[PDB]
Design a protein around this nucleic acid. Structure first.
Ligand SMILES: [Mg+2]
Ligand SMILES: [Mg+2]
Ligand SMILES: [Mg+2]
Ligand SMILES: [Mg+2]
Ligand SMILES: [Mg+2]
Ligand SMILES: [Mg+2]
Ligand SMILES: [Mg+2]
Ligand SMILES: [Mg+2]
Ligand SMILES: [Mg+2]
Ligand SMILES: [Mg+2]
Ligand SMILES: [Mg+2]
Ligand SMILES: [Mg+2]
Ligand SMILES: [Mg+2]
Ligand SMILES: [Mg+2]
Ligand SMILES: [Mg+2]
Ligand SMILES: [Mg+2]
Ligand SMILES: [Mg+2]
Ligand SMILES: [Mg+2]
Ligand SMILES: [Mg+2]
Ligand SMILES: [Mg+2]
Ligand SMILES: [Mg+2]
Ligand SMILES: [Mg+2]
Ligand SMILES: [Mg+2]
Ligand SMILES: [Mg+2]
Ligand SMILES: [Mg+2]
Ligand SMILES: [Mg+2]
Ligand SMILES: [Mg+2]
Ligand SMILES: [Mg+2]
Ligand SMILES: [Mg+2]
Ligand SMILES: [Mg+2]
Ligand SMILES: [Mg+2]
Ligand SMILES: [Mg+2]
Ligand SMILES: [Mg+2]
Ligand SMILES: [Mg+2]
Ligand SMILES: [Mg+2]
Ligand SMILES: [Mg+2]
Ligand SMILES: [Mg+2]
Ligand SMILES: [Mg+2]
Ligand SMILES: [Mg+2]
Ligand SMILES: [Mg+2]
Ligand SMILES: [Mg+2]
Ligand SMILES: [Mg+2]
Ligand SMILES: [Mg+2]
Ligand SMILES: [Mg+2]
Ligand SMILES: [Mg+2]
Ligand SMILES: [Mg+2]
Ligand SMILES: [Mg+2]
Ligand SMILES: [Mg+2]
Ligand SMILES: [Mg+2]
Ligand SMILES: [Mg+2]
Ligand SMILES: [Mg+2]
Ligand SMILES: [Mg+2]
Ligand SMILES: [Mg+2]
Ligand SMILES: [Mg+2]
Ligand SMILES: [Mg+2]
Ligand SMILES: [Mg+2]
Ligand SMILES: [Mg+2]
Ligand SMILES: [Mg+2]
Ligand SMILES: [Mg+2]
Ligand SMILES: [Mg+2]
Ligand SMILES: [Mg+2]
Ligand SMILES: [Mg+2]
Ligand SMILES: [Mg+2]
Ligand SMILES: [Mg+2]
Ligand SMILES: [Mg+2]
Ligand SMILES: [Mg+2]
Ligand SMILES: [Mg+2]
Ligand SMILES: [Mg+2]
Ligand SMILES: [Mg+2]
Ligand SMILES: [Mg+2]
Ligand SMILES: [Mg+2]
Ligand SMILES: [Mg+2]
Ligand SMILES: [Mg+2]
Ligand SMILES: [Mg+2]
Ligand SMILES: [Mg+2]
Ligand SMILES: [Mg+2]
Ligand SMILES: [Mg+2]
Ligand SMILES: [Mg+2]
Ligand SMILES: [Mg+2]
Ligand SMILES: [Mg+2]
Ligand SMILES: [Mg+2]
Ligand SMILES: [Mg+2]
Ligand SMILES: [Mg+2]
Ligand SMILES: [Mg+2]
Ligand SMILES: [Mg+2]
Ligand SMILES: [Mg+2]
Ligand SMILES: [Mg+2]
Ligand SMILES: [Mg+2]
Ligand SMILES: [Mg+2]
Ligand SMILES: [Mg+2]
Ligand SMILES: [Mg+2]
Ligand SMILES: [Mg+2]
Ligand SMILES: [Mg+2]
Ligand SMILES: [Mg+2]
Ligand SMILES: [Mg+2]
Ligand SMILES: [Mg+2]
Ligand SMILES: [Mg+2]
Ligand SMILES: [Mg+2]
Ligand SMILES: [Mg+2]
Ligand SMILES: [Mg+2]
Ligand SMILES: [Mg+2]
Ligand SMILES: [Mg+2]
Ligand SMILES: [Mg+2]
Ligand SMILES: [Mg+2]
Ligand SMILES: [Mg+2]
Ligand SMILES: [Mg+2]
Ligand SMILES: [Mg+2]
Ligand SMILES: [Mg+2]
Ligand SMILES: [Mg+2]
Ligand SMILES: [Mg+2]
Ligand SMILES: [Mg+2]
Ligand SMILES: [Mg+2]
Ligand SMILES: [Mg+2]
Ligand SMILES: [Mg+2]
Ligand SMILES: [Mg+2]
Ligand SMILES: [Mg+2]
Ligand SMILES: [Mg+2]
Ligand SMILES: [Mg+2]
Ligand SMILES: [Mg+2]
Ligand SMILES: [Mg+2]
Ligand SMILES: [Mg+2]
Ligand SMILES: [Mg+2]
Ligand SMILES: [Mg+2]
Ligand SMILES: [Mg+2]
Ligand SMILES: [Mg+2]
Ligand SMILES: [Mg+2]
Ligand SMILES: [Mg+2]
Ligand SMILES: [Mg+2]
Ligand SMILES: [Mg+2]
Ligand SMILES: [Mg+2]
Ligand SMILES: [Mg+2]
Ligand SMILES: [Mg+2]
Ligand SMILES: [Mg+2]
Ligand SMILES: [Mg+2]
Ligand SMILES: [Mg+2]
Ligand SMILES: [Mg+2]
Ligand SMILES: [Mg+2]
Ligand SMILES: [Mg+2]
Ligand SMILES: [Mg+2]
Ligand SMILES: [Mg+2]
Ligand SMILES: [Mg+2]
Ligand SMILES: [Mg+2]
Ligand SMILES: [Mg+2]
Ligand SMILES: [Mg+2]
Ligand SMILES: [Mg+2]
Ligand SMILES: [Mg+2]
Ligand SMILES: [Mg+2]
Ligand SMILES: [Mg+2]
Ligand SMILES: [Mg+2]
Ligand SMILES: [Mg+2]
Ligand SMILES: [Mg+2]
Ligand SMILES: [Mg+2]
Ligand SMILES: [Mg+2]
Ligand SMILES: [Mg+2]
Ligand SMILES: [Mg+2]
Ligand SMILES: [Mg+2]
Ligand SMILES: [Mg+2]
Ligand SMILES: [Mg+2]
Ligand SMILES: [Mg+2]
Ligand SMILES: [Mg+2]
Ligand SMILES: [Mg+2]
Ligand SMILES: [Mg+2]
Ligand SMILES: [Mg+2]
Ligand SMILES: [Mg+2]
Ligand SMILES: [Mg+2]
Ligand SMILES: [Mg+2]
Ligand SMILES: [Mg+2]
Ligand SMILES: [Mg+2]
Ligand SMILES: [Mg+2]
Ligand SMILES: [Mg+2]
Ligand SMILES: [Mg+2]
Ligand SMILES: [Mg+2]
Ligand SMILES: [Mg+2]
Ligand SMILES: [Mg+2]
Ligand SMILES: [Mg+2]
Ligand SMILES: [Mg+2]
Ligand SMILES: [Mg+2]
Ligand SMILES: [Mg+2]
Ligand SMILES: [Mg+2]
Ligand SMILES: [Mg+2]
Ligand SMILES: [Mg+2]
Ligand SMILES: [Mg+2]
Ligand SMILES: [Mg+2]
Ligand SMILES: [Mg+2]
Ligand SMILES: [Mg+2]
Ligand SMILES: [Mg+2]
Ligand SMILES: [Mg+2]
Ligand SMILES: [Mg+2]
Ligand SMILES: [Mg+2]
Ligand SMILES: [Mg+2]
Ligand SMILES: [Mg+2]
Ligand SMILES: [Mg+2]
Ligand SMILES: [Mg+2]
Ligand SMILES: [Mg+2]
Ligand SMILES: [Mg+2]
Ligand SMILES: [Mg+2]
Ligand SMILES: [Mg+2]
Ligand SMILES: [Mg+2]
Ligand SMILES: [Mg+2]
Ligand SMILES: [Mg+2]
Ligand SMILES: [Mg+2]
Ligand SMILES: [Mg+2]
Ligand SMILES: [Mg+2]
Ligand SMILES: [Mg+2]
Ligand SMILES: [Mg+2]
Ligand SMILES: [Mg+2]
Ligand SMILES: [Mg+2]
Ligand SMILES: [Mg+2]
Ligand SMILES: [Mg+2]
Ligand SMILES: [Mg+2]
Ligand SMILES: [Mg+2]
Ligand SMILES: [Mg+2]
Ligand SMILES: [Mg+2]
Ligand SMILES: [Mg+2]
Ligand SMILES: [Mg+2]
Ligand SMILES: [Mg+2]
Ligand SMILES: [Mg+2]
Ligand SMILES: [Mg+2]
Ligand SMILES: [Mg+2]
Ligand SMILES: [Mg+2]
Ligand SMILES: [Mg+2]
Ligand SMILES: [Mg+2]
Ligand SMILES: [Mg+2]
Ligand SMILES: [Mg+2]
Ligand SMILES: [Mg+2]
Ligand SMILES: [Mg+2]
Ligand SMILES: [Mg+2]
Ligand SMILES: [Mg+2]
Ligand SMILES: [Mg+2]
Ligand SMILES: [Mg+2]
Ligand SMILES: [Mg+2]
Ligand SMILES: [Mg+2]
Ligand SMILES: [Mg+2]
Ligand SMILES: [Mg+2]
Ligand SMILES: [Mg+2]
Ligand SMILES: [Mg+2]
Ligand SMILES: [Mg+2]
Ligand SMILES: [Mg+2]
Ligand SMILES: [Mg+2]
Ligand SMILES: [Mg+2]
Ligand SMILES: [Mg+2]
Ligand SMILES: [Mg+2]
Ligand SMILES: [Mg+2]
Ligand SMILES: [Mg+2]
Ligand SMILES: [Mg+2]
Ligand SMILES: [Mg+2]
Ligand SMILES: [Mg+2]
Ligand SMILES: [Mg+2]
Ligand SMILES: [Mg+2]
Ligand SMILES: [Mg+2]
Ligand SMILES: [Mg+2]
Ligand SMILES: [Mg+2]
Ligand SMILES: [Mg+2]
Ligand SMILES: [Mg+2]
Ligand SMILES: [Mg+2]
Ligand SMILES: [Mg+2]
Ligand SMILES: [Mg+2]
Ligand SMILES: [Mg+2]
Ligand SMILES: [Mg+2]
Ligand SMILES: [Mg+2]
Ligand SMILES: [Mg+2]
Ligand SMILES: [Mg+2]
Ligand SMILES: [Mg+2]
Ligand SMILES: [Mg+2]
Ligand SMILES: [Mg+2]
Ligand SMILES: [Mg+2]
Ligand SMILES: [Mg+2]
Ligand SMILES: [Mg+2]
Ligand SMILES: [Mg+2]
Ligand SMILES: [Mg+2]
Ligand SMILES: [Mg+2]
Lengths: 272, 49
RNA sequence: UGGCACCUCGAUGUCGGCUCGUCGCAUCCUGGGGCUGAAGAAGGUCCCAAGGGUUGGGCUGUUCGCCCAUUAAAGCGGCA
RNA sequence: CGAAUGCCGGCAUGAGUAACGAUAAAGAGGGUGAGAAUCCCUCUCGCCGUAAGCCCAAGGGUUCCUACGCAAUGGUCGUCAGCGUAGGGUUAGGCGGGACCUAAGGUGAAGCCGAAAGGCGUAGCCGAAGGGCAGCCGGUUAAUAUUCCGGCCCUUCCCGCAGGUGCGAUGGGGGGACGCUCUAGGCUAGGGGGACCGGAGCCAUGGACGAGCCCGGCCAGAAGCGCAGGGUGGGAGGUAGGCAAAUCCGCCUCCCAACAAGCUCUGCGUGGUGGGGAAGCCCGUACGGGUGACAACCCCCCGAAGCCAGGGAGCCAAGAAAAGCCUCUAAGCACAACCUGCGGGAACCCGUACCGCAAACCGACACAGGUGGGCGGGUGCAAGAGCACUCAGGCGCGCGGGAGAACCCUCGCCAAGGAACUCUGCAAGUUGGCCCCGUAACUUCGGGAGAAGGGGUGCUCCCUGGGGUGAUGAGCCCCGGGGAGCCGCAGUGAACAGGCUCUGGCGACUGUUUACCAAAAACACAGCUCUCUGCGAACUCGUAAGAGGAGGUAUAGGGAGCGACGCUUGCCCGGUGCCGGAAGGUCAAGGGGAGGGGUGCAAGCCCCGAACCGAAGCCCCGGUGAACGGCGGCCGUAACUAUAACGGUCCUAAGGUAGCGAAAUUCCUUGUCGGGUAAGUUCCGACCUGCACGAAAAGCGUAACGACCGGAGCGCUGUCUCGGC
RNA sequence: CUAGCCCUGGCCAGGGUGAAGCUGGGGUGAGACCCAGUGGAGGCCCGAACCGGUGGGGGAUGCAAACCCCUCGGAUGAGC
RNA sequence: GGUUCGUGGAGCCAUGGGGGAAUCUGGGCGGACCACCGCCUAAGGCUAAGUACUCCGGGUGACCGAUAGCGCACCAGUAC
RNA sequence: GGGGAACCUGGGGAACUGAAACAUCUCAGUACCCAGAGGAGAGGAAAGAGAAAUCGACUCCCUGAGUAGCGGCGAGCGAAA
RNA sequence: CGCGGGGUGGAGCAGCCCGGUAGCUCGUCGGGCUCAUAACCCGAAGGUCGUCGGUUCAAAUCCGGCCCCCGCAACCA
């Protein structure tokens, strides 16, 4: 869902925040499996390289499990569901019999106390992780490895979900959240389900302020700056682009494709 | 009318310090001429404890 | 309103208003006066004559101008 | 050398002129001294008091104290000084740093990269107002004191003796550990009272020897006690995780315990014991010393934003690390070793003066500026760190004396009128606190509201209802209600405290901005669309290494434009851009050599060079507008005129839809009608021949907001008539 | 100095409005919903410190190479 | 890239890339190239002297003489 | 391992100016940066020069020569035997 | 009063640049079709190519002045 607020103040008239029903019982994180001092700062050694980043609430990183193939077989009871402030999606804190606890980017439908596991064996069911190729062609899964043993990467952004279309020799075809069709190695694990909190997309920040809470600094439009500063700037009294819309740097911003052609990654993909 | 000069020992010993000049290849050259020139102070005077 | 560009570009601050005026007469008024398509009363026009007067408002940055309300009259123009 | 607004130096002119640095204010009698408004003293007077007063940090560095002095520095004087000379003065295991820890960031064995300088970078190291860690009250000096001394109380190290125990790591684990807003229960600093306790004294001018006036009624403190509250389940089995191992943590299962009790740890009382302790009077340069005292040191009431504290509740934007400290076991060692008692020794380096919202710091000056933290009393005003007065404390600002013109500044008042002032009611007024009536359109239901506009507000006596601390009564504090009555011109009696309506433009809104002429209708902004990006992402910085993106992964990242919200966002891809086109034309090195040439007696050695195979780009075919952009001319027609729904004809890629419209866009133009005014180039409503509006360089609206810009009116006024004191 | 961001600390008197949630009542087949009360939200409101710097006046060889006075803006936040 | 040589008929000496021998009847040079005729032995290394400079010491001057001469004749690279 | 006024070799390497504009060219391989060398450094016994069947390691001075040449054949630059 | 385009039968365009002929659509006029009109079919007529001069053997067409119509310009002042 999502809560709305009675307009007892502007900037509240439209604000809405994700409710935390399935936020189980939590608030504080497990101080072992995470957290980690999270190095905040909006640029590389020296200069800034990603404009409009800075300030905004403190944060402790949650070292979450991205390769479940580690503990094959060893199962786990889902202890609870926590709020992680570093990712759209919610996370699950689970207790393995092994005695080791880990956090798992939590899927939708996942219930506390319920159980799960990883490995070829594993049953096709919400939360269990299997090598792609042992998954029922046509069953949506999330958290997906790209190249075997190289960790999880596709679908893990709340409501995100990949889907098996078929398989060829080694690979299985997948439709990532981008509609794009791609082939991935059978060995790559993927954990069945489909992430959760598919509502995130429906929060309305409401006020300029909240965008700073998240840590997003005000964004200056090009058509506001001066020639020296940007390709879109000058003469004023407002003004149309006067040239194909460009970036601060000079490349066309609407249209101009940027994926480099001669890439090895192709030969494995078929359109977006 | 807060001005340009707001004294700060550390800031000063750390910025124009003797060890500072040595660290950089440009720092060295400063001293080098400061010596050649015959200055009584190679680095700025600023103490502590 | 312009033309010329003669002193001033090691600087001669430009509209308008306010303040303070002072000069001119090609007199708006008040004084004389000739004429008159001047019965009277009003005027018209032209000749002497500034001595002194030459209102308050609405609209506009305005100067000008259009109005409101009066007046004996509600002058025009020079003084960077 | 006369000139270069020449260069260096000197000395003039203005000029005995402007000034002498906040309008907080001075006056007198003594002192001293060659000489004093200006220095010491005393008595009056005035100013600061959420200070113009105390304590701390930075910075400054001897400016501290004292004895001599006054040429110069002090915007005057100087017998004074923060000035000259000289001499003293800054005393720790417990306070702050270092012999402890880690943050961002530095540096940096490996290892990576660079023409050289040099750039990265794992572990470690450095790095702090953050963590950790053992002290309070008094007395003392001219000047230092949680350091010196007194009383009381702690901390580690080494050795020794007695007693427990598998002891032991830089490794495992636990803890340290953490947000914001609102809060409870107790305490404390702190304060107000007192019919009670202790006090030198006073009855003054009409009155009072009175439960009168006035001063003061505490502070520190181990053990044990209490009184608050913080912490934490004990067992037994297993065990494949915590990268060795564990008897430890972490998991399963079963016993007991279970909004607790128990063991712990703080704070607060009390505590052996120690210390202080006014007024006033007397000496007295200074500004301390006695006396008061064998001082008393008790009772209430108010009470923290501070303590118990890792306490609790709610919320989302979801809130450091490392050591100390416990515990678990490794190599080791088990005569070691730790742990606990108790003794005895050992306990370093640096800072410590003084100014410190300022005459000793940053502003060239004893510069009306700027500077982080804590304490900051009392009464009153509804509250308060506000305002007025005043404690303690500290000041009258380092030129004065007279006068009583113009003129300037700052301030007060005003007849009648009231904005007639002016670009504009600019400025100044008006209004202003709190309690109670009572409030419209419009609205996104919140708002508009403190709308507007009203009345009350002082003091005296009576009656009476509730709170808190005692106990359910007394007193002491804190919230009310009703009833009579007094006095003034006036009762938030002074000081702090909105002028108010109507209607337009722009931007939705709180925010940002040209530090030193613009705060805005500009920027930002939630939100909307477009486009790139499948992850060694795209983009950005970088020669590279590497890094930001991101320990992110399409409900996410980057780029662009518009810019809450409502209703909408027409038509045109001809030219340009970007996307898609395994065909064609063109196309460079290169491949290939038809064939020609220079040389040699030749084998040869050397040069050229046409077919034809040869990319991307371009040409060519298509697409695409919240991609750059564009979105017609001329004639003719209807029951009077007028217009023109209709037509004819050129022209295009297509020929501006809705909606608005003399507008932030209208030249002619003070367009023409209405409305407001006695009068209206502006203003509001209309109309449209829109010089030259128009749909995300968005279009038209829009409740609410604007120190934004425009037009009315009410109130009130020296803005003005018209000045005056 | 000034701009931004990263690490670690600190600061914001006193008033006012009163959201969601709760609790009870009402209502219904069960609801939504409607009341009170409790509750404490918010780039909410009045207003000191604090951060600003709106309008006017003074200052213009200044107290000052941007200052003073009255008057205004924000003031738990995109806060200092 | 160097040489006078900036493509020029562009050689010679260096090379970054590519291809890639030979051992003296081997191999480079004589300004495209070839043939004669000459010259010289590349792909390892070292080597006095004559040459340059003058912080330092000394000698002289049709050199300066305290605004000159070094910025400093003076406790100056100081004070500021 | 670092220093030393200049001098020296090497690794890099400008611009104003000149061309009475400017772009090749010039200013210049100059300024400056970097590394190294020492009282010097560099170079040095020939796969040299060049027309004489000639010279005979390198370095430095004078000539040759502002010649030969180079060159928007402009400005100007400029050898060796 | 700068610079550019233009003015062709009743309407609106082409012809002109590379001088010798003036073409197109509509309308106009006659005939047809229909009871009739429009539509439709057949046929026809219709223009000093602004105007005054000039170049040539010859001008709409090439040159110059005048006039009128449209587009852009009129700025620092
Ligand atoms: Mg938490
Ligand atoms: Mg940790
Ligand atoms: Mg750096
Ligand atoms: Mg913040
Ligand atoms: Mg954004
Ligand atoms: Mg923007
Ligand atoms: Mg701009
Ligand atoms: Mg820049
Ligand atoms: Mg540009
Ligand atoms: Mg532009
Ligand atoms: Mg414009
Ligand atoms: Mg698609
Ligand atoms: Mg300065
Ligand atoms: Mg600093
Ligand atoms: Mg004239
Ligand atoms: Mg002039
Ligand atoms: Mg002059
Ligand atoms: Mg002058
Ligand atoms: Mg004037
Ligand atoms: Mg006359
Ligand atoms: Mg007469
Ligand atoms: Mg008048
Ligand atoms: Mg007006
Ligand atoms: Mg006059
Ligand atoms: Mg002369
Ligand atoms: Mg004078
Ligand atoms: Mg005078
Ligand atoms: Mg002065
Ligand atoms: Mg004077
Ligand atoms: Mg003074
Ligand atoms: Mg006196
Ligand atoms: Mg005296
Ligand atoms: Mg005085
Ligand atoms: Mg005194
Ligand atoms: Mg006395
Ligand atoms: Mg007070
Ligand atoms: Mg304060
Ligand atoms: Mg003062
Ligand atoms: Mg200090
Ligand atoms: Mg000083
Ligand atoms: Mg001294
Ligand atoms: Mg003394
Ligand atoms: Mg003395
Ligand atoms: Mg003196
Ligand atoms: Mg003085
Ligand atoms: Mg002075
Ligand atoms: Mg003096
Ligand atoms: Mg003093
Ligand atoms: Mg002294
Ligand atoms: Mg001690
Ligand atoms: Mg201290
Ligand atoms: Mg030691
Ligand atoms: Mg030591
Ligand atoms: Mg250590
Ligand atoms: Mg250390
Ligand atoms: Mg670190
Ligand atoms: Mg190193
Ligand atoms: Mg480094
Ligand atoms: Mg360390
Ligand atoms: Mg702490
Ligand atoms: Mg600390
Ligand atoms: Mg410690
Ligand atoms: Mg300590
Ligand atoms: Mg204690
Ligand atoms: Mg002292
Ligand atoms: Mg003491
Ligand atoms: Mg002691
Ligand atoms: Mg102890
Ligand atoms: Mg023992
Ligand atoms: Mg034992
Ligand atoms: Mg043990
Ligand atoms: Mg053992
Ligand atoms: Mg250990
Ligand atoms: Mg230990
Ligand atoms: Mg540990
Ligand atoms: Mg919490
Ligand atoms: Mg409490
Ligand atoms: Mg007390
Ligand atoms: Mg008390
Ligand atoms: Mg009190
Ligand atoms: Mg009292
Ligand atoms: Mg008392
Ligand atoms: Mg008391
Ligand atoms: Mg009493
Ligand atoms: Mg009593
Ligand atoms: Mg008594
Ligand atoms: Mg007594
Ligand atoms: Mg008594
Ligand atoms: Mg007695
Ligand atoms: Mg007595
Ligand atoms: Mg007595
Ligand atoms: Mg008496
Ligand atoms: Mg008393
Ligand atoms: Mg008393
Ligand atoms: Mg006490
Ligand atoms: Mg006590
Ligand atoms: Mg247990
Ligand atoms: Mg066991
Ligand atoms: Mg184990
Ligand atoms: Mg193990
Ligand atoms: Mg307990
Ligand atoms: Mg206790
Ligand atoms: Mg205690
Ligand atoms: Mg006790
Ligand atoms: Mg005692
Ligand atoms: Mg006493
Ligand atoms: Mg005493
Ligand atoms: Mg005496
Ligand atoms: Mg005395
Ligand atoms: Mg005594
Ligand atoms: Mg006694
Ligand atoms: Mg309390
Ligand atoms: Mg508090
Ligand atoms: Mg509290
Ligand atoms: Mg606490
Ligand atoms: Mg808590
Ligand atoms: Mg508790
Ligand atoms: Mg062993
Ligand atoms: Mg022992
Ligand atoms: Mg012991
Ligand atoms: Mg002991
Ligand atoms: Mg000791
Ligand atoms: Mg001290
Ligand atoms: Mg001290
Ligand atoms: Mg002082
Ligand atoms: Mg002090
Ligand atoms: Mg201050
Ligand atoms: Mg302070
Ligand atoms: Mg002070
Ligand atoms: Mg003084
Ligand atoms: Mg000073
Ligand atoms: Mg002073
Ligand atoms: Mg001052
Ligand atoms: Mg000063
Ligand atoms: Mg400040
Ligand atoms: Mg301050
Ligand atoms: Mg207080
Ligand atoms: Mg009292
Ligand atoms: Mg007070
Ligand atoms: Mg009262
Ligand atoms: Mg009050
Ligand atoms: Mg005050
Ligand atoms: Mg006051
Ligand atoms: Mg009193
Ligand atoms: Mg006093
Ligand atoms: Mg003071
Ligand atoms: Mg005094
Ligand atoms: Mg004064
Ligand atoms: Mg003073
Ligand atoms: Mg009076
Ligand atoms: Mg009054
Ligand atoms: Mg009056
Ligand atoms: Mg009156
Ligand atoms: Mg009036
Ligand atoms: Mg009136
Ligand atoms: Mg008026
Ligand atoms: Mg007026
Ligand atoms: Mg007027
Ligand atoms: Mg107005
Ligand atoms: Mg005003
Ligand atoms: Mg009033
Ligand atoms: Mg009033
Ligand atoms: Mg209402
Ligand atoms: Mg009212
Ligand atoms: Mg009232
Ligand atoms: Mg009274
Ligand atoms: Mg009764
Ligand atoms: Mg009562
Ligand atoms: Mg009672
Ligand atoms: Mg109480
Ligand atoms: Mg009562
Ligand atoms: Mg009566
Ligand atoms: Mg009365
Ligand atoms: Mg009354
Ligand atoms: Mg009052
Ligand atoms: Mg009132
Ligand atoms: Mg009052
Ligand atoms: Mg007031
Ligand atoms: Mg108010
Ligand atoms: Mg408005
Ligand atoms: Mg308007
Ligand atoms: Mg705005
Ligand atoms: Mg709008
Ligand atoms: Mg701006
Ligand atoms: Mg500002
Ligand atoms: Mg400004
Ligand atoms: Mg301003
Ligand atoms: Mg503003
Ligand atoms: Mg929108
Ligand atoms: Mg790059
Ligand atoms: Mg974006
Ligand atoms: Mg996007
Ligand atoms: Mg915009
Ligand atoms: Mg807009
Ligand atoms: Mg197009
Ligand atoms: Mg296109
Ligand atoms: Mg196309
Ligand atoms: Mg293409
Ligand atoms: Mg070829
Ligand atoms: Mg070829
Ligand atoms: Mg042949
Ligand atoms: Mg032949
Ligand atoms: Mg040959
Ligand atoms: Mg191609
Ligand atoms: Mg072509
Ligand atoms: Mg248009
Ligand atoms: Mg119109
Ligand atoms: Mg109008
Ligand atoms: Mg209008
Ligand atoms: Mg208007
Ligand atoms: Mg009218
Ligand atoms: Mg009016
Ligand atoms: Mg009208
Ligand atoms: Mg527009
Ligand atoms: Mg437009
Ligand atoms: Mg459109
Ligand atoms: Mg558009
Ligand atoms: Mg509009
Ligand atoms: Mg509006
Ligand atoms: Mg605002
Ligand atoms: Mg600042
Ligand atoms: Mg800024
Ligand atoms: Mg901070
Ligand atoms: Mg409420
Ligand atoms: Mg029910
Ligand atoms: Mg309610
Ligand atoms: Mg409620
Ligand atoms: Mg409450
Ligand atoms: Mg607020
Ligand atoms: Mg406000
Ligand atoms: Mg204020
Ligand atoms: Mg404070
Ligand atoms: Mg101001
Ligand atoms: Mg002024
Ligand atoms: Mg003036
Ligand atoms: Mg306000
Ligand atoms: Mg406020
Ligand atoms: Mg050439
Ligand atoms: Mg060359
Ligand atoms: Mg050859
Ligand atoms: Mg090669
Ligand atoms: Mg041979
Ligand atoms: Mg060769
Ligand atoms: Mg060769
Ligand atoms: Mg030859
Ligand atoms: Mg040879
Ligand atoms: Mg050899
Ligand atoms: Mg040698
Ligand atoms: Mg010599
Ligand atoms: Mg000699
Ligand atoms: Mg001489
Ligand atoms: Mg000299
Ligand atoms: Mg010398
Ligand atoms: Mg000498
Ligand atoms: Mg060296
Ligand atoms: Mg070189
Ligand atoms: Mg140049
Ligand atoms: Mg040139
Ligand atoms: Mg030029
Ligand atoms: Mg050259
Ligand atoms: Mg040598
Ligand atoms: Mg030789
Ligand atoms: Mg030359
Ligand atoms: Mg002309
Ligand atoms: Mg015609
Ligand atoms: Mg016919
Ligand atoms: Mg017919
Ligand atoms: Mg003809
Ligand atoms: Mg002819
Ligand atoms: Mg211009
Ligand atoms: Mg202009």
């Amino acid at each position: 869902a999502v809560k709305k607020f009675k307009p007892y103040t502007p900037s509240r008239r439209f604000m809405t925040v994700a409710d935390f029903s399935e936020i189980t019982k939590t608030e504080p994180e497990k101080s072992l499996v995470k957290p980690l001092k999270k190095t905040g700062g909006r640029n590389n050694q020296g200069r800034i390289t990603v404009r409009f980043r800075g300030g905004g609430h403190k944060r402790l990183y949650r070292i979450i499990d991205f390769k479940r193939w580690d503990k094959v077989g060893i199962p786990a009871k889902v202890a609870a569901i926590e709020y992680d402030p570093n990712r759209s999606a919610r996370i699950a804190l689970l207790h393995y019999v092994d005695g080791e606890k880990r956090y798992i980017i939590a899927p939708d439908g996942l219930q506390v106390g319920q159980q799960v596991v990883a490995g070829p064996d594993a049953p096709i069911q919400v939360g269990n992780a299997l090598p792609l190729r042992f998954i029922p062609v046509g069953t949506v899964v999330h958290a997906v490895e790209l190249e075997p043993k190289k960790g999880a990467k596709l679908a893990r952004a709340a409501g995100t979900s990949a889907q098996i279309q078929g398989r060829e020799g080694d690979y299985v075809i997948l439709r990532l959240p981008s509609g794009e069709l791609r082939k991935v190695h059978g060995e790559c694990y993927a954990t069945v389900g489909a992430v959760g909190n598919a509502d995130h997309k429906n929060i309305v920040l409401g006020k300029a302020g909240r965008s700073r809470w998240l840590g997003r600094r005000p964004h200056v439009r090009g058509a506001a700056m001066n020639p020296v500063d940007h390709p879109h700037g000058g003469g004023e009294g407002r003004a149309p682009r006067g040239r194909p819309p460009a970036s601060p740097w000079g490349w066309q911003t609407k249209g101009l494709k940027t994926r480099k052609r001669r890439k090895p990654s192709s030969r494995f993909i078929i359109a977006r | 009318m807060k001005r340009t000069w707001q004294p700060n020992r550390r800031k000063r010993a750390k910025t124009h310090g003797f060890r500072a000049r040595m660290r950089t290849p440009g720092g060295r050259k400063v001293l080098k001429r400061r010596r050649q020139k015959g200055r009584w102070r190679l680095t700025p005077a600023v103490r502590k404890r």
